[PDB]
Amino acid sequence: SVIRWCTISSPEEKKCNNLRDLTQQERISLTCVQKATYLDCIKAIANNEADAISLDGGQAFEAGLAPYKLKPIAAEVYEHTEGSTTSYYAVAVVKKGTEFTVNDLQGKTSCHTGLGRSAGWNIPIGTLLHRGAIEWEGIESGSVEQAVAKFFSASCVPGATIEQKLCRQCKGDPKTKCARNAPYSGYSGAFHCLKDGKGDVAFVKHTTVNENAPDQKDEYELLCLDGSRQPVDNYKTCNWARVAAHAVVARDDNKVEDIWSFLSKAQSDFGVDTKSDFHLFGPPGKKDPVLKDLLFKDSAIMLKRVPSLMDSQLYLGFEYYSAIQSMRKDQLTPSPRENRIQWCAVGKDEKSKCDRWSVVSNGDVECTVVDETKDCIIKIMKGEADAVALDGGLVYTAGVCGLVPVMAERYDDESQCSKTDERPASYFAVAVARKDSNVNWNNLKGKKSCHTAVGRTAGWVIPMGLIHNRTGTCNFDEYFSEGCAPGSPPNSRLCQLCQGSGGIPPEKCVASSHEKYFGYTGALRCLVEKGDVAFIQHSTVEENTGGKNKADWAKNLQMDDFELLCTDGRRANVMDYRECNLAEVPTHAVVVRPEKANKIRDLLERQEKRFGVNGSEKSKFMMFESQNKDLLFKDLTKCLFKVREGTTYKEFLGDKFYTVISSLKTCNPSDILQMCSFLEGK
Ligand SMILES: [Fe+3]
Ligand SMILES: [Fe+3]
Predict the structure, then answer these.
(1) Which uninterrupted H or E stretch holds 73?
(2) Helix intervals (H) in 338-459
(3) What DSSP element (H or E) covers 544?
(4) What residues form DSSP beta bridges with 484?
(5) Torsion angle in degrees (nearest 10) through CA of 153, 156, 157, 160
(6) Under DSSP, is residue 416 helix (H, G, I), strand (E, B) or coil?
(7) Which residues are glycosylated?
(8) How crowded is the C-beta side of 597, counted as CA atoms within 13 Å?
């Protein structure tokens, strides 16, 4: 196509154009739209007049807000000693020998990169708001601009519309001087501000003294939040925050595909290892402040692509996003919560059981309904729901996204969740077949398979990881004729035995209880009315036979109709899961953000007293009851036990299990796993 990069200063526009000419005879090409501001570029990308632009984390928060809904497409990478992550560190630079601490900043003069930028404004002013030095309570006590103008004696905050005091130390002419591209703008202009004696403090990133005064580094210090002062190189132990990198945003559409093609071209041709006169990232030399950080920051070394599930809210993190909002609303007022556990139900039957839970607890629990169980993960990460109970396979995924197992399911007896005088708790993964059949473990190829869902412990992680040991492929779709493994791609072989809903919009091969064949009992039902194997839990056959499941298909079933398949030998008795299983796996657990673990552990124990297996109001509601549909919780559950504080998903899951998912993930990784893997490697 011709990618329309938006620029915001006449030097940037000028660089934009040298790249138009070096790419002018290529497949993906370029134009360089120049507007007066970065917001004027956000509007032009939202109105199809330009296509891309790289924005500071605080401006990436604005681009993602409606009407605009602009997405993170690409992210800058920085030289890290850890790795080379897509984040940087905000630091506050002062001169060696001035005596003040972070506690003495009142009355001083300050130099900021820009109003609303992360290191230059959001992190310092938000941090001072929270320590109690800048006194702001919420928008009803003034703007943040008025609150800072009473703290600092004069500042240069190139962006300030309201207070004139924030433009007083700025350098340049009577109109242009307090603009976002003025000489004292950006990380280096704010550094020159300090170097020229105009600020006592400069709020910049961890690389700024090295980008503008490398031999003069010994004349400068950093202000640490513990009251101390350290050297400019000790930023890793003396920073104010680690923030998300600057990111290339764009309209969420087909053009995205080309914006990355173009950028991966110039990364390869014009990067850090280049020999041309065109440098895309840099070079980071001492230079005029106005020629610094054009189009991309001089500190970038390459671009990394953000996975498509991401949105600004998700890119910036819960802690930082919640900070930019703080500075837009009074604290008491939208902040009551710790009295209500917002549970996340998946699909319609789980929505029904949760609304009764919410009616019968006179409100102590409320419900969010989603469609897939990956949506619950995202809702909890964003602070829009608080807990959900997930399977061992799906706890791995939440564990990569930073959620923690706070309570887990105990499948044996009711009194056993009070334990000193025993520890552990697990269930078993199993291969079930009908006794008439010819199939055994090694006969398993080219057959029909029934799976609880793609992604889950017993019905996919254990079986596919043993078929992946032998097969050496991540194409289990070619290892059967067909199956029903809900959640797979809709037009494949593992979708064909699946039935769908009643059959109204029909929804087959979906990962909720709308699909007939979903979960442990839906996959016994697949074995029974259509397939060769059912990859299930050890008790799925006892629970649905001997007359206990009173549905059509299950009315007549007895446990003599089936047999297990051991990794090898025989076929075995369905009640010998101990000796003929595929694995002993950890149980299902409730996973929450680490800071909400206290509330919901306590709010959930109150709830099981009233509706647990020996609840006091069982009569109205029993929590681990669903009609063999394992709604909200598994039906086998006798009680729920507390998982000790500071337990990591890896420790809960066990090392034996931790290994298996870290084998199948070289095979096709889900879009949620990839997104969260960008954030843990951020
Ligand atoms: Fe920045
Ligand atoms: Fe399970």
Answers:
(1) strand 71-77
(2) 348-360, 373-381, 392-400
(3) helix 540-544
(4) 450
(5) 80
(6) helix
(7) 469
(8) 19
Read off φ and ψ for residue 237, nearest 5 degrees. -105, 10
CA 523–ligand 2 middle distance (angstroms): 12
Long-range contacts of 164-170 (CB under 8 A, 24+ apart): 166/115, 169/109, 169/111, 169/193, 169/198, 169/199
Per DSSP (E only), the strands in 325-444 are 341-346, 365-370, 389-390, 404-410, 426-434
Burial of 363 (0-12, 13-18, 19+ CB in 10 A): exposed
Strand 201-205 relative to strand 29-34, pairing: unpaired
Q: Rounded CA gap, 61 and 161, in Å? A: 20
Residue 104: CB partners within 8 Å, gap ≥ 6? none
| Ligand 2 center–CA 603 separation, angstroms | 24
* Integer CA distances (angstroms), 386 to 280, 359, 361, in order: 43, 18, 17
Q: What's the DSSP call for residue 522? A: H
Q: How far is the CA of 417 from the centre of ligand 1 (A)?
A: 49
d(CA 194, CA 41): 30
Each domain of the chain, given as residue ranges in start order, spans 1-87+244-335, 88-243, 336-426+586-681, 427-585
Cα separation, 398 vs 405, whole angstroms: 9
Measuring CA to CA, which residue among 646, 637, 650, 654 is closest to residue 597?
A: 646
Q: What b/e sequence results for 110-134 when a residue is b if at least 16 CB atoms lie within 10 Å of its CB, and e otherwise?
A: bbbbbbbbbbbbbbbbbbbbeeeeb
Q: Which ligand is nearest to the CA of 393?
A: 2
Fold of the domain built from segment(s) 427-585: D-Maltodextrin-Binding Protein; domain 2 (3.40.190)
Distance 639 CA to ligand 1 centre (A): 49
Q: Is residue 409 a contact partner of residue 652, using CB atoms and an 8 Å limit?
A: no
Whether 1-87+244-335 shares its CATH topology with 336-426+586-681 is answered: yes
Q: How far is the CA of 354 from the centre of ligand 2 (A)?
A: 20
C-alpha–C-alpha distance, residues 131 and 251, integer Å: 38
Query: Class of the 1-87+244-335 domain?
Result: alpha beta
Task: Count Cβ atoms below 10 Å from residue 566 Cβ, excluding itself.
Answer: 18
Residues 427 and 420: their CA atoms lie apart, in Å, by 20
SS3 241: strand
Binding site listing: 56, 88, 113, 117, 119-120, 187, 246, 391, 427, 452, 456, 458-459, 520, 588
Q: How far does residue 657's CA lie from ligand 2's centre (Å)? A: 13
Dmax over CA atoms of the chain, in Å, equals: 91
Give the whole-angstrom CA distance, residue 107 versus residue 200: 10
Which residue spans within 96-216 are E strands per DSSP?
109-111, 154-156, 201-205
Q: Which residues are annotated as a binding site for Fe(3+)?
A: 56, 88, 187, 246, 391, 427, 520, 588
Least Cα distance to 444 among 473, 427, 464 occurs for 464
- Rounded distance from Cα 251 to ligand 2 centre (Å): 39
C-alpha 504/C-alpha 522 separation (Å) is 19
The domain defined by 336-426+586-681 folds into: D-Maltodextrin-Binding Protein; domain 2 (3.40.190)
Q: Cα–Cα distance between 210 and 165 in angstroms, integer?
A: 29
Contacts 24+ apart (CB under 8 A), 544-547: 544/628
Spatial distance between the Cα atoms of 406 and 390, rounded to a whole number of angstroms: 11
Q: What is the DSSP annotation of 637-658? A: --EEEE--TT--HHHHH-HHHH
Query: How many other C-beta atoms are found inside a 10 Å radius of the C-beta of residue 393?
Result: 25
CA 339–ligand 2 middle distance (angstroms): 30
How far does Cα 78 stand from its chain's mean position?
A: 20
Q: Look up residue 247 and give its amino acid.
A: A
Q: How far is the CA of 635 from the centre of ligand 2 (A)?
A: 11
